[PDB]
Amino acid sequence: GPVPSRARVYTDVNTHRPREYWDYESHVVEWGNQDDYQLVRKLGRGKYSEVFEAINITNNEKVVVKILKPVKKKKIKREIKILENLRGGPNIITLADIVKDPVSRTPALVFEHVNNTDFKQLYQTLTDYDIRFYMYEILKALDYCHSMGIMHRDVKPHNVMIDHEHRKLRLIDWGLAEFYHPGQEYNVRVASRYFKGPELLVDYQMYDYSLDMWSLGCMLASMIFRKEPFFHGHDNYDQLVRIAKVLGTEDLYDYIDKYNIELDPRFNDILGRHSRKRWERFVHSENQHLVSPEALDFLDKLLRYDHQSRLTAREAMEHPYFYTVVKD
Numbered sequence: 336g337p338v339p340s341r342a343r344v345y346t347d348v349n350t351h352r353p354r355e356y357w358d359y360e361s362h363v364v365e366w367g368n369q370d371d372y373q374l375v376r377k378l379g380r381g382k383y384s385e386v387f388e389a390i391n392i393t394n395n396e397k398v399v400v401k402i403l404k405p406v407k408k409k410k411i412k413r414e415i416k417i418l419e420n421l422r423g424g425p426n427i428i429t430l431a432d433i434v435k436d437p438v439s440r441t442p443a444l445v446f447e448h449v450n451n452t453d454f455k456q457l458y459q460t461l462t463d464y465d466i467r468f469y470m471y472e473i474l475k476a477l478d479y480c481h482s483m484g485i486m487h488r489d490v491k492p493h494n495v496m497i498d499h500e501h502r503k504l505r506l507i508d509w510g511l512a513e514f515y516h517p518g519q520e521y522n523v524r525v526a527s528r529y530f531k532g533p534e535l536l537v538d539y540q541m542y543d544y545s546l547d548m549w550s551l552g553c554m555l556a557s558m559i560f561r562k563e564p565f566f567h568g569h570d571n572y573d574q575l576v577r578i579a580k581v582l583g584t585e586d587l588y589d590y591i592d593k594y595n596i597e598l599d600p601r602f603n604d605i606l607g608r609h610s611r612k613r614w615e616r617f618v619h620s621e622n623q624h625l626v627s628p629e630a631l632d633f634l635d636k637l638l639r640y641d642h643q644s645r646l647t648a649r650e651a652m653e654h655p656y657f658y659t660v661v662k663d
């Protein structure tokens with residue numbers, strides 16, 4: 336069987352919290368007044384919800400309302416509990432209210448509003464300095480939630496709201512987030528394909544906060560190299576092949592051998608043999624202004640097969656890549 340794994344940091348945070356902190360199935364929702372909020376326009380539709388711009392008519396302020404589609408109540412309570420636990424933390428989206436929508440017959444989450452620019456358009460304008468700045472701001476959110484016993488499990492550009500005018504960033508969509516408990520086995524059907532960690536792609540269930548660090552590395556690679564997404568797989572199997580063409584097949588075998596994991600035999604015909612590549616091969620005249628030796632070293636230390644070898648969020652904040660970021 337597979338060798339077990341533990342987080343190298345924040346391992347016991349939920350063990351020593353009171354049960355109420357992580358026992359989201361028992362959480363009792365405090366409902367606000369649904370009539371306080373007037374929907375203005377639909378912003379998006381997801382797998383599990385629709386999201387709207389709205390006005391809070393008790394203060395005439397803009398808010399964002401996420402009306403959940405039907406899903407098991409445990410999942411709804413999990414997201415609500417995590418948002419309440421994390422509220423006030425650095426760059427964590429603020430849950431302002433929870434109301435019962437009379438049409439959907441489901442909960443509607445009310446969030447603070449971020450005047451965001453969509454990442455496809457924002458990322459073609461960010462400078463080297465902008466990228467370092469916003470990466471540091473994401474790390475603040477990730478170190479906070481990890482230190483609070485929570486893994487996000489869906490880090491991707493779509494879930495980072497940036498108001499570029501005010502240099503304001505919020506990490507959103509905590510609907511896939513979970514509490515970390517040592518030895519717990521988790522669903523591997525999390526994160527978006529391009530941001531899935533090797534642990535998910537080889538079906539290793541005893542993963543931890545370090546999953547978010549792989550996803551963050553995928554975001555970094557796409558921004559500094561100007562290739563979005565960086566690892567562009569056509570399905571979950573090809574996703575691992577795309578990663579192996581860069582990190583190499585020998586270290587993939589070292590990873591699964593360490594945890595006594597077997598690759599899906601489907602890979603026998605598609606994986607091939609690949610050397611590990613040097614990151615300099617992805618640098619060219621149209622992205623070199625975003626690349627530095629510090630950026631490549633930092634990226635190299637995030638994108639490790641072995642989840643136990645990746646930088647933690649706190650270690651990442653100590654990396655020389657962030658020395659040029661102005662600290663407040």
Ligand SMILES: COc1ccc(/C=C2\S/C(=N\c3ccccc3C)NC2=O)cc1O
Nearest residue numbers: 379380381386399446447448449507508509
């Ligand atoms: C425009 O400013 C905001 C925008 C969104 C949020 C919160 C969301 S949106 C979400 N999920 C969906 C739902 C449908 C479509 C797409 C997504 C990402 N989860 C959250 O926490 C907060 C904001 O201030």
